[PDB]
Paper text:
AQPs are membrane-integral water channels that are present in all organisms where they facilitate passive flow of water across the membrane as a direct response to the osmotic pressure. Here, we present the first structural and functional characterization of a fish aquaporin; cpAQP1aa from the fresh water fish climbing perch (Anabas testudineus), a species that is of high osmoregulatory interest because of its ability to spend time in seawater and on land. These studies show that cpAQP1aa is a water-specific aquaporin with a unique fold on the extracellular side that results in a constriction region. The overall structure of cpAQP1aa shares most of the common AQP structural features; assembling as a homotetramer with each monomer forming a functional pore and consisting of six transmembrane α-helices (1–6) and five connecting loops (A-E).
Because flexible termini are known to hamper crystallization of AQPs, C-terminally truncated cpAQP1aa (cpAQP1aa-243, where residues 243–261 were deleted) was produced in Pichia pastoris, purified, and crystallized. A single file of water molecules is aligned within the pore of each monomer, indicating that cpAQP1aa is in a functional state. Loops A and C are partly disordered, with residues 34–37 and 108–112, lacking electron density, and these parts have been omitted from the structure. The pore constricts to a radius of ∼1.2 Å at the ar/R region, formed by residues Arg 187, His 172, Cys 181, and Phe 50, a width and residue composition that is typical for water-specific AQPs. However, when comparing the channel profile of cpAQP1aa with those of the water-specific channel human AQP4, the aquaglyceroporin human AQP7, and the ammonia-permeable TIP2;1 from Arabidopsis thaliana, a unique pore narrowing at the extracellular side is identified. This region is defined by a novel conformation of loop C, placing residues 114–117 (cpAQP1aa numbering) closer to the center of the extracellular vestibule. As a result, Leu 117, Ile 176, and Gly 180 form a hydrophobic constriction region with a radius of 1.1 Å, ∼8 Å away from the ar/R region. The unique conformation of loop C is stabilized by a hydrogen-bonding network that involves Tyr 107 in transmembrane helix three, residues 114–119 in loop C, and Arg 187 within the ar/R region. Specifically, hydrogen bonds are formed between the side chain of Tyr 107 and the backbone nitrogen of Leu 119 as well as the carbonyl oxygen and side chain of Asn 114 and 116, respectively, via a water molecule. In addition, the Arg 187 guanidino group forms hydrogen bonds to the backbone oxygens of Leu 117 and Gly 118.
Author numbering:
A (entry chain A), B (entry chain A), C (entry chain A), D (entry chain A): 1 to 34, 38 to 108, 114 to 226
Write the structure that this text describes.
C-alpha cells in the first residue's frame, strides 16, 4: 500500500499538524506571557516540556518530530521517505503559522532574533544547539539499542530545554525552522530568518551523519 | 459483582478523594505561599509535581484522575462507567473544597481568574491547555502501547506543569474544574467560573475524540 | 544469620549514615549558599535532587530512607524490623549532625523555623507534607506492583521537592526529623523542634496505615 | 584485537571528544549568557541537562564520562583500562579547551573560582560534590543491578545539577577537572586551579572505593 495512499501515513501527517499547533500555541503563550532575562528559564522549560509532552502523546503515531531539522535529520538517517519529510515539514510550518496567528492575533521571545551576536555567530550557535537536539533524537530512538530504559520523549524534551538555556540569550533559540517561521510570517518580520533555517538544518543533517557514519555505524 | 457494590470501586473513589485533597492542599499552599510573575514557575512546578507524585502513588488504585476533565475524557474514551465518572467528580470537588477550606481558613494564584483576556479568550486558552493534558493522559495510559518505558505519572505531571507555564499569566491555569471550584466556593467568588468548566471539559472530550477517533483509532 | 550479626545489615546502616551525611551536606550548602523567597525553588530543588540522587545510588543497599519518617512508615508497614528502624534513625541523626557541623562550622533556610504560622498549624503542614512523601515511597516501592516503569528514586526525590514547594514558606519544610535535628543541635536552637518530629512521624505512620489498610490492602 | 588498535575504542574516544565539546559549548554559553546569584539555577540546570542529554546520546558508545573524575572513578573501579582513562581524559581536556575557545573567543560562572571560601574549604566542597556524582554514575551503571528502571543518563545529569546547586556559590562548581581546565587555559587564569583537580579526583576515587569495597562489594 503506497505511502501517499496510506491511512497511517496521513494520520501521521495529521499528528504532526496537531502536535505542532499545540507545541507552538503553548510555548508562545508562555514566551509572550506576563523582562527577558527573567523569562529565560520559564520559556526554556515551556518549550522543552511542550516537546516532552507532545512526543509522549504522539510519538507512536508520527514520531512527533515537530521540527523540520529533526525531520531532515531522519531523512539523512534514511529513516523516512522524501514524501514523508516534505509533508511533515509542510504540516509543521502550517501548524506553527496557525498557532502563531492565534497567540499573536519584536517585543519578546515569541520572535527569534539575534541579540549581541552577528548572523554568522548566530548560525553557529543555532547549528550546535540543534545538533545536540537531533543527535539526542536519533540516538534515543535508535532501534538497535536495548538500554534506553527511561522516557525517550522526556530526554528529547529536556534536550529542547537545554538548547534554549544555551542559545536563548544569543538567538532567542530557534533550533526548529518551523517554530521560527510561524512568528516571522505572522509578524511579517523575516530579519535574519535564514539564520534559523541554515543553522538548524545543517545541525540536524550533521547529527545524523556523525551518529550514523562515525560514532554508531550501521 | 456490581460496581456500586464493589469494594475496589469505593477504594478507588476514596483514593480520588484522598489524592485530590492532598493535591489541592499542597498546590494551594505553594500558590499562596510567601509578586505573581515571580511565582509563576514555582506554582507551575508545585501543581505539576503534585500530580506527578499523587498519580505515581494512587494511579494503580483509581487511575489518579484528580481532575473532572480527565475523568470526562476517560468517559468519552469509554474507559470508565458513568457511575465512576460521577463519583470521581464528586470526590474531586469534595476533596478540593476540603483542601481549600484548610488552606484559606482575590489576592493570589489560589483563585483562578482572568488576567488581560476576555472570557471567550480564557475559554479557548483553558481548552487548549486542558486538551494537551488529557491527550497526554489518554495517550500515555493507552494499553495497546508497548513503548511507554519511562514514568507515565511523571509525563502527566510535567504536562500539568506545561499547562501552567502556558496559561497561568492569562487565566491562572485551571485545566481542572474541581481545582477551580474549591477556592471559588471557599472564597464565594464565582466570577468567570463557567470558563473553568466549559474550557477544560470541552478540551478533555476533544482530546479523547481526536486521539481515539482520528489519530490512533480502535 | 541474625540481623544484628549480619554483614548486609551493617552495610545498610552504613549506607544510611553515608547517604544522610551527603544529603544534608549538599542540601544545607545550597540552602545557606549565596533573600529567602528568592531561594525557595533553588532550595526545594536541591533537597529533592539530593534525595533522588542518593536513593538512586544507595536504594538497593539500604532502601535509602534517609528520613526517620520514612523509616517509621516502613516499620508501620511491617517492612523493616524494630532493630533496623532504630539503627537507621540513629544513623540518620548522626549523619545530619555531622553534615550540619561541617556546613555551619537563625538567618536562613538551614534551620527549620515557623514563619507566620502557629506551632499547631506547623504540625499539620509538616504532617501533610510528610504524608505525601511517605505515601509516595511506600507506593512506588510496593513489591506487588508491576507498573512502576520509570525511576522510583526520581519519583521520591520529586515528592521531596513538592513537599518543599508546599511547606517551605510556612515551616521551612522539615518533613524529615533528622534533617531538622542536625541544624537544631549544631545551632543549639530547639525552638518549635517538636513540630518537626510530631508532624512528620504522624504523617509517615498515617501514610502506611492509609495505603496498606485502606487503599491497597494486603 | 588490542584496544589501541581497535575501531570501537577510537570511536569511544571520539564520542568523548565530541560529547565534551558540546557539553562545554552549551553549558558555558548558558553560564556566560545574558547577576550571579540570579543565574545559579539556570546554570545548574544547563550543566545537568547537558550531561543528561549527552550521556543519553553517547553513553552506549563510550560510557559518556565527559569528566576526568568519572573516568578516574571507573579506573579505580577496574571498569576501564589505563589506556582508555588516559585517552578519555586527553579527549575531555581537548574538547573543553576547544569549546572554551569558541565561546570566549574573571567576570562570570564560565571560570570556576573560589567565592568566600579558602582553597582547602574549596577542595572539600569539590570533593563531596564530585563524590556524590561519581557515586551515582558507578551505582546507576552497576551491571549487577536489575532495579534501575528509569533513565540512568537523567539520574547522572540531575546529580550534576545537584552538585551545582550545592557548590556553585562557593567554588563555581567544577566537579569535573576538564570542565575547569578549558576556561582556565583560554583565560590564562590558573588561580586556585589545583583545587578543581585535587578535590574532584579524590572524590571520584573515594566514590569507587566506598561503593565497591564497602557498600556493594564484589
Amino acid at each position: 500500500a503506497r505511502e501517499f495512499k496510506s491511512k497511517n501515513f496521513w494520520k501521521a501527517v495529521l499528528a504532526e499538524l496537531v502536535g505542532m499547533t499545540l507545541f507552538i500555541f503553548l510555548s508562545l503563550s508562555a514566551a509572550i506571557g506576563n523582562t527577558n532575562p527573567d523569562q529565560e528559564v520559564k520559556v526554556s522549560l515551556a518549550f522543552g516540556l511542550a516537546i516532552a509532552t507532545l512526543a509522549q502523546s504522539l510519538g507512536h503515531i508520527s514520531g512527533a518530530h515537530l521540527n523540520p531539522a529533526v525531520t531532515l535529520g531522519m531523512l539523512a538517517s534514511c529513516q523516512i521517505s522524501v514524501l514523508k519529510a516534505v509533508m511533515y515539514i509542510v504540516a509543521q510550518m502550517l501548524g506553527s503559522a496557525l498557532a502563531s496567528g492565534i497567540v499573536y492575533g519584536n517585543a519578546n521571545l515569541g520572535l527569534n532574533a539575534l541579540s549581541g551576536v552577528t548572523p554568522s555567530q548566530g548560525v553557529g550557535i543555532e547549528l550546535l544547539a540543534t545538533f545536540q537536539l537531533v543527535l539526542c533524537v536519533i540516538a534515543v530512538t535508535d532501534k538497535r539499542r536495548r538500554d534506553v530504559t527511561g522516557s525517550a520523549p522526556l530526554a528529547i524534551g529536556l534536550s529542547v530545554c537545554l538548547g534554549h538555556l544555551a542559545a536563548i540569550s544569543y538567538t532567542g533559540c530557534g533550533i526548529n525552522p518551523a517554530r521560527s517561521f510561524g512568528p516571522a510570517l505572522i509578524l511579517n518580520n523575516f530579519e535574519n530568518h535564514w539564520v534559523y533555517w541554515v543553522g538548524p538544518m545543517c545541525g540536524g543533517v550533521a547529527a545524523a551523519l556523525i551518529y550514523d557514519f562515525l560514532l554508531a555505524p550501521k
